[PDB]
Amino acid sequence: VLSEGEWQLVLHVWAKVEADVAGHGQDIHIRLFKSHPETLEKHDRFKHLKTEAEMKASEDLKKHGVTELTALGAILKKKGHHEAELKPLAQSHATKHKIPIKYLEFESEAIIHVLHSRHPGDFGADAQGAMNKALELFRKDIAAKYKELGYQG
């Protein structure tokens, strides 16, 4: 369980994300797609963007990142009481997009790296530790939802 203070650290750096959701989403995908090229294949519809500049210039990829980040933020704000919006997410990612939990750990690494690069003064050790906890709680719970629908994560 996260303590109240850890949820507050998570939501404090999240307010900084919400200052530029589109830019954060672009930077998280570029980082994810550079670190773990297998993960850009899964995003088959962006599979052909070759450079960071092309990635930034994609309004489609830009909107996609805002959609994912908006969904994650709504989850984080529930501070763990998030079953209701995990269910539709798990169903689409399990049965449609086919995303293993290790891809989710890859994306969490990219989130933590982008949040650190962009807001170090608002994202130090206690905060990164609280965000790692939040995202692993998200991974744990959705892994469970995966199983409930069949097919492992």
Is 113 annotated to bind ligand?
no
Handedness of CA 57, 132, 74, 9 (dihedral sign): negative
> Which amino acid is located at 11 in the chain?
L
Residue numbers 65-94 binding Fe ion by CB under 5 A: 68
Cα diameter, the chain: 43
| Contact window for ligand HEM (CB under 6 A) among 9-17, 76-84, 85-93, 126-134 | 85-93
Is 64 annotated to bind ligand?
yes
Asked whether 106 and 36 are in contact (CB, 8 A), the reply is: yes
| Contact window for ligand HEM (CB under 6 A) among 37-45, 49-57, 114-122, 145-153 | 37-45
Asked whether 141 and 72 are in contact (CB, 8 A), the reply is: no
Q: Does 47 bind ligand HEM (CB under 6 A)?
A: no
Q: Distance between CA atoms of 75 and 58, rounded to whole angstroms?
A: 26
| Contact window for ligand HEM (CB under 6 A) among 4-12, 18-26, 103-111, 117-125 | 103-111
Tell me the residue number closest to ligand HEM, measured at CB: 92
Asked whether 60 and 46 are in contact (CB, 8 A), the reply is: yes
6: partner contacted, choices ligand HEM, Fe ion, none (Cβ within 5-8 A by kind): none
22: partner contacted, choices ligand HEM, Fe ion, none (Cβ within 5-8 A by kind): none
Given candidates 7, 25, 30, 39, which one binds ligand HEM under the rule CB under 6 A? Answer: 39
Handedness of CA 90, 85, 19, 123 (dihedral sign): negative
Interface residues toward Fe ion, by CB under 5 A: 68
**Residues tagged in the binding site annotation for O2:** 64
